[PDB]
Amino acid sequence: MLEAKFEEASLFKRIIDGFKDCVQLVNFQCKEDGIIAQAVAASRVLLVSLEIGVEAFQEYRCDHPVTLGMDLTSLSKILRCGNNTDTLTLIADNTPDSIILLFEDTKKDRIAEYSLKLMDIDADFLKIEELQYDSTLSLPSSEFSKIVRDLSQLSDSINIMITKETIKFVADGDIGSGSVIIKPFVDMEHPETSIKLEMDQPVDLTFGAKYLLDIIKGSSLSDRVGIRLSSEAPALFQFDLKSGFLQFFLAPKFN
Amino acid sequence: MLEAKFEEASLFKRIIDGFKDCVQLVNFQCKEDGIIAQAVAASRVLLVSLEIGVEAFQEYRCDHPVTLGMDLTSLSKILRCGNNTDTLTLIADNTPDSIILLFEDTKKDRIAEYSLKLMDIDADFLKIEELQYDSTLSLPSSEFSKIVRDLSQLSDSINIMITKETIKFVADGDIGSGSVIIKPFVDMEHPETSIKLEMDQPVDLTFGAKYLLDIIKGSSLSDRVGIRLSSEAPALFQFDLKSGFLQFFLAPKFN
Amino acid sequence: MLEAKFEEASLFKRIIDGFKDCVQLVNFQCKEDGIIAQAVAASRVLLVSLEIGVEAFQEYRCDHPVTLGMDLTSLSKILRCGNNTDTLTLIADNTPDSIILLFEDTKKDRIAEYSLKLMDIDADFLKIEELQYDSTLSLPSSEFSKIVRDLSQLSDSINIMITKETIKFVADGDIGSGSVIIKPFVDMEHPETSIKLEMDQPVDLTFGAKYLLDIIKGSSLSDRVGIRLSSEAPALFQFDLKSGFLQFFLAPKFN
């Protein structure tokens, strides 16, 4: 018996909008220490990993573990409901068929109570992260977003390219070509406009722009995006939450 | 010879936007005491009844009765014209072929004068309202609108259900299910957020959500919606105007 | 070797948005005294003539003349890039294959550098303007825009009609008919709301509304539109820039 009460219903809506456009189904493992989730694109080139810790809820109680599969399209239809600053309460009784989402507003009158049917997904859950990534940068999520969006208009493939104190995004298509170079710097008038970079080995990797575009939708959810690149593994783009995170693992393009 | 001068052109535009999306044609009976109108959906499950009394015009003069039929799509194209705070003047000469709509703005320069061709509709006009309805509730039109819109995503049919001091809206579909319960209360910090209910007999009726969705567009036009339900007749949803009203009669779904 | 530096990148974007929707290709002649351009609709009923003088650039240097053809769809994709208040720098080396567009923002970090491939257009450039036009009016570009947009809903053809101190726009279709009359006046509380008219001969001409609609998009670019009509030639609609202009030559409809 689960009873997890988001402070503002807008968060859960947002974390789900954050990543709904790239994957159709999703398995939510609810535990004593919060809910965690994973979603693999059907293409198997993008994985979405989510963690919501207890400190992201106004209240939270999971007596036993529960796994809730659910169609993201359905769940987010239900999440357009209610008002934006209401208490959304996830509820499930043990070994369930239905999760129910229970919205109540700053007065006690509208008791809006939806209930979603659960899909059945098998928990081949993936641990795809690495100890050490060839490079690690970190920049404003809005910035990463303009440069992705901008370059996606030129071809299907954006090429990230990292060399000592130099992070370079590039697209190359029929129209023409595009090239956004950026460099690390601690700015102090807003220590959050900054750009961090740690390089152990230079990288040069290419990515589907389709997917980069899906990934940057997570900017609604943190001011900063951390992206970790490696030749040996999928790249990891990560948006930190209050308690928790939203990760996107993304595989590079071949030749 | 008709010469009816709306104060703000935005009103007539709005009362027509209020109900244009559900019915294609419309017969406007213009009389000494104002204009009244009726429109039946082709499906014959929704009737739209309008009254605009003299106190909704800055000026008004109908020498003899006139009936003006007109295609709502055409009329509302003409009503996108001019500016939003202009004097819109309906004009017709007796036994006419064309209504003309005459827009003029807060300076005397733009004389914008459109003219619409009249369709020919036969006046099988309907008196479908009842003396006593099983129940009568009354709530904020914006509220009724969110709860309609919210539930319409779950199935094609929303089910209203009224029992002593309890008004309950419900939808039930494949996704899952939804249930918004609401209760009467005189609030006094804004006596207009309130919720009134008068029940003589409990009701339980189902409605096309298509149509509920068309109906709530009338919320642009009054802060409050009054809805009157009966087993023996179509339900009546009503938005009050300054002088007049916009009614929707709506028939329930069968089995 | 060209190096032309718009103050705000938004201008070049805007002058191109101003007229991109009517013509697909465009030949930009760059010279010591600025850049000038011409674009003919494939229908050969609309010509677009542009002049950007040196005083529209923060810096400008054209060593030798250069002609740059370019697909407007491609160029404006590139012009959605960067931020709205950045320095956009047109660059070309002599006898080039590629123009490059170089965006930099109010801090020196994002060096965003796109490059467009040039099409090959033959410079059959047109001098289609007249010494004396039957009439010359001049009005607020936003006004000309509402009256165009408004009337276009009634038919495919708007008819301008000028007679001593009387400028009259009219549309006539199946729906009905529309008629916006306007008259000259020096207003002084804003000498820019005014309406000027000079008539040498009355005119009566008809125009594709398609095209009038494309033309009025130039209102983003000047508060005033000047339109010059003649029976013997295409009408000239003109939006003045800081240093330069955007003209539309438009041919009348036959019978």
Residue numbers in the entry:
A (entry chain A), B (entry chain A), C (entry chain A): 1 to 255
Can you quote the paper on this entry?
PCNA is a ring-shaped homotrimeric protein, with each subunit consisting of two domains connected by a flexible linker called the inter-domain connecting loop (IDCL). CAF-1 association with replicating DNA, and the targeting of newly synthesized histones to sites of DNA replication and repair requires its interaction with proliferating cell nuclear antigen (PCNA), the eukaryotic sliding clamp that acts as a processivity factor for polymerases during DNA synthesis. Recruitment of PCNA-interacting proteins to replication forks is generally mediated by a conserved sequence in these proteins called a PCNA-interacting protein (PIP) motif that interacts with PCNA in a region between the two domains on a single subunit near the IDCL. In this study, we focused on three separation-of-function amino acid substitutions in PCNA that cause defective gene silencing and exhibit reduced CAF-1 association with chromatin in vivo, as well as inhibit binding to CAF-1 in vitro partially or completely (D41A/D42A, R61A/D63A, and L126A/I128A).
The X-ray crystal structure of the D41A/D42A mutant protein was determined to a resolution of 3.05 Å. The D41A/D42A substituitions are located on the front face of PCNA in loop D (residues 41–44) between β strands C1 and D1. The D41A/D42A substitutions are located on the front of the PCNA ring in loop D (residues 41 to 44), which is approximately 10 Å away from the canonical PIP-interacting region. The global structure of the mutant PCNA trimer is very similar to the structure of the wild-type PCNA trimer. Compared to the wild-type structure, there are significant backbone changes in the structure of the D41A/D42A mutant PCNA protein in loop D. The α carbon of residue 42 has moved by 1.2 Å relative to its position in the wild-type PCNA structure, and the α carbon of residue 43 has moved by 1.0 Å. These backbone changes in loop D and the substitutions of the shorter alanine sidechains at residues 41 and 42 are the only significant changes in the structure of the mutant PCNA protein compared to the structure of the wild-type PCNA protein. One of the three PCNA mutations, D41A/D42A, is located directly within one of the loops that defines this cavity. In the structure of the D41A/D42A mutant PCNA protein, the replacement of the larger, negatively charged aspartate residues with smaller, non-polar alanine residues causes alterations (>1 Å) in the positions of the backbone of several amino acid side chains that line the edges of the surface cavity, including residues 41 and 43 in loop D and residue 123 in the IDCL. Together, these changes result in the formation of a smaller, more “closed” surface cavity compared to the cavity in the wild-type structure.
